Amino acid sequence: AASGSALIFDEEMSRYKLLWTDPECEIEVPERLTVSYEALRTHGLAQRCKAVPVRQATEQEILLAHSEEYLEAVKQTPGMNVEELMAFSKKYNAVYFHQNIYHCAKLAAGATLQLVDSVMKREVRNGMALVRPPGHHSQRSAANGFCVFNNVAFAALYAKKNYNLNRILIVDWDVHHGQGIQYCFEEDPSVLYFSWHRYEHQSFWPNLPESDYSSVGKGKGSGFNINLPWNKVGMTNSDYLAAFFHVLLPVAYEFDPELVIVSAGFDSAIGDPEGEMCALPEIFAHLTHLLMPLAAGKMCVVLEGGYNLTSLGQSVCQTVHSLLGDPTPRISGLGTACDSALESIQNVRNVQSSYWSSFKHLAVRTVVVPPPGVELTLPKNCQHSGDISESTAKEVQRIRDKHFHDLTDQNILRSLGNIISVLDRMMRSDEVCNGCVVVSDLSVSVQCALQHALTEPAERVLVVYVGDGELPVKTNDGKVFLVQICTKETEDKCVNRLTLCESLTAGFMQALLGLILPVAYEFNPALVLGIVEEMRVWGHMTCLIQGLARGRMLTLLQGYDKDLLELTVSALSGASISPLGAPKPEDVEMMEKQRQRLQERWGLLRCTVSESW
Numbered sequence: 307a308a309s310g311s312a313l314i315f316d317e318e319m320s321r322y323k324l325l326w327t328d329p330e331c332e333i334e335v336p337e338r339l340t341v342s343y344e345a346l347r348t349h350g351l352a353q354r355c356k357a358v359p360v361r362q363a364t365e366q367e368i369l370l371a372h373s374e375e376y377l378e379a380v381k382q383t384p385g386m387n388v389e390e391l392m393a394f395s396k397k398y399n400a401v402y403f404h405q406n407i408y409h410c411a412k413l414a415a416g417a418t419l420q421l422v423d424s425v426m427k428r429e430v431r432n433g434m435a436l437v438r439p440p441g442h443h444s445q446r447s448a449a450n451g452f453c454v455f456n457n458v459a460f461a462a463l464y465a466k467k468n469y470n471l472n473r474i475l476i477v478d479w480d481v482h483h484g485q486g487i488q489y490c491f492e493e494d495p496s497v498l499y500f501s502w503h504r505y506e507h508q509s510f511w512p513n514l515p516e517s518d519y520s521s522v523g524k525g526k527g528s529g530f531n532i533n534l535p536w537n538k539v540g541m542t543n544s545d546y547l548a549a550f551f552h553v554l555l556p557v558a559y560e561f562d563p564e565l566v567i568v569s570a571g572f573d574s575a576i577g578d579p580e581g582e583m584c585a586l587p588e589i590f591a592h593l594t595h596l597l598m599p600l601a602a603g604k605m606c607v608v609l610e611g612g613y614n615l616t617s618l619g620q621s622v623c624q625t626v627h628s629l630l631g632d633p634t635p636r637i638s639g640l641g642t643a644c645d646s647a648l649e650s651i652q653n654v655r656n657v658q659s660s661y662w663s664s665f666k667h668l669a670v671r672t673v674v675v676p677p678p679g680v681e682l683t684l685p686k687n688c689q690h691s692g693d694i695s696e697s698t699a700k701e702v703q704r705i706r707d708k709h710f711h712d713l714t715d716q717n718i719l720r721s722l723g724n725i726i727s728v729l730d731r732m733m734r735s736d737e738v739c740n741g742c743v744v745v746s747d748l749s750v751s752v753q754c755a756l757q758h759a760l761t762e763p764a765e766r767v768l769v770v771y772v773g774d775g776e777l778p779v780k781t782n783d784g785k786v787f788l789v790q791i792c793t794k795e796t797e798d799k800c801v802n803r804l805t806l807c808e809s810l811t812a813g814f815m816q817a818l819l820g821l822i823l824p825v826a827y828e829f830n831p832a833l834v835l836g837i838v839e840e841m842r843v844w845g846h847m848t849c850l851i852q853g854l855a856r857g858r859m860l861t862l863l864q865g866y867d868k869d870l871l872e873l874t875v876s877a878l879s880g881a882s883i884s885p886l887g888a889p890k891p892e893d894v895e896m897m898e899k900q901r902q903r904l905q906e907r908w909g910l911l912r913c914t915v916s917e918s919w
């Protein structure tokens with residue numbers, strides 16, 4: 307099992323700049339790298355990473371994605387003067403050269419490959435490469451968009467050649483379109499490329515019609531190229547999370563990539579002079595967190611864009627915070643995506659529906675309280691309950707004598723006291739983050755847990771229950787939401803409940819991505835409460851649900867199943883999730899009925915533009 311995050315940086319890639327007047331390239335400055343690294347130092351993040359040294363990518367490694375003619379042309383640049391460098395740069399669009407830029411491009415490519423080697427050799431779980439020059443615009447025989455060599459396409463081809471990978475996901479969240487990556491893998495079904503980008507109906511750089519949603523890939527790669535064009539500026543956290551939930555994440559979890567590579571361009575963040583979007587840097591934690599269960603956590607975040615030198619640091623720090631397993635911040639104010647985003651999402655979903663069927667339409671952080679008298683090997687970052695306290699027992703006696711009463715079983719009372727202690731240590735302290743408890747009586751345990759959490763205080767509580775029957779929880783007031791996954795059809799009354807009733811694994815994952823997570827993110831709970839009465843998708847569920855409530859999740863398990871207990875504990879402690887690798891049409895109809903029944907209240911469910919009266 308691999309552990310730790312790799313940070314790969316070198317001050318040498320900060321030693322090339324623009325040597326002439328050019329308002330188009332004035333933003334791409336060396337200080338970018340500096341601002342990032344110092345930021346990671348200030349919040350104590352770079353020190354928590356394994357620092358892998360950069361290297362030069364070799365000639366043949368460069369020839370994996372570029373031609374001999376272009377490589378020979380660039381290798382001649384370190385011998386040019388400023389007039390010659392400017393004349394050479396004039397031969398391409400939106401790029402400038404320097405005497406050190408060939409050296410630094412070899413270093414950026416080599417750092418990318420070092421990250422790939424470190425992640426695939428299980429030396430580290432994931433990693434980030436702070437490189438310069440960027441790469442996602444460069445092409446086989448041309449430099450483009452501040453890019454010399456395509457670092458991420460290098461990484462994909464390198465992984466394929468040196469580890470025999472069959473499926474590699476590339477996620478490009480730069481506001482610009484990785485034309486070079488697309489070009490490189492357009493007819494390659496091995497490498498699934500997703501990109502969102504500011505397009506403005508083709509009036510924005512690079513002004514390519516193939517940057518539209520119509521480009522789904524050519525030949526054998528048709529369906530493995532996904533372009534989401536924003537045609538209006540000012541896209542927010544809601545637009546980004548809707549794009550993730552209703553386009554990328556379902557396709558990615560069905561693709562089941564053996565390796566995730568991210569083009570980390572942070573010009574999609576608020577404040578950037580180039581992107582002009584309104585997405586907070588915190589969103590890049592969740593963008594990262596939602597991608598974690600893929601490829602068993604093997605993620606290679608590579609730097610691309612980002613030119614606001616007073617917010618690049620915040621975005622990079624959020625990405626690294628998420629990569630190290632730190633709790634993601636609570637995203638508030640979420641709602642429906644804007645009409646332009648909904649149009650882009652529905653258009654890409656429609657065009658892609660012939661390749662991904664889910665798009666068709668009808669015309670110490672963890673605390674463990676195991677059964678009294680058991681003993682298990684808790685992960686290095688898990689401990690047991692520290693017995694109880696005098697105040698805990700007094701509150702237990704009060705709750706007993708005042709409410710249920712007629713209860714003398716010391717086991718159920720001890721379970722309730724442990725639940726109270728875990729809540730007090732999760733919410734009213736910066737120590738434990740999440741926790742799991744095995745209980746006996748479902749009614750008493752659930753009532754105690756919920757009612758005590760509400761007075762922690764907890765502004766709101768998400769309640770994910772797996773089982774049948776009615777549990778004692780009120781969905782009338784606006785303080786508790788319930789997601790129940792049962793077997794009986796029940797009904798779809800109220801609007802603060804999501805009831806869901808073998809290919810059940812694909813159906814459950816689709817329901818989690820398209821229904822559960824959007825409503826949960828818009829709800830913004832202060833605590834997630836898991837209940838399971840007496841399956842094999844619970845790991846991804848528990849991992850992805852920790853994006854809510856700043857990670858605070860209390861799980862109650864009715865049944866001493868060591869498998870499920872170990873799975874829950876490892877999911878809470880932050881361990882890697884083994885991937886899964888065709889849902890029933892009745893379940894699809896039920897999911898769409900739930901969507902049509904809830905989306906007027908929970909706008910994150912919407913993946914089509916609403917029609918007025």
Ligand SMILES: NCCc1cccc(C(=O)CS)c1
Nearest residue numbers: 330400451452482511580611
């Ligand atoms: N205003 C300049 C427009 C431009 C041109 C080429 C690349 C970029 C990038 O941000 C690289 S990701 C921006």
Ligand SMILES: [K+]
Nearest residue numbers: 478480501502
């Ligand atoms: K992009």
Ligand SMILES: [K+]
Nearest residue numbers: 491494497530
């Ligand atoms: K492709």
Ligand SMILES: [Zn+2]
Nearest residue numbers: 480482571611
């Ligand atoms: Zn960019």
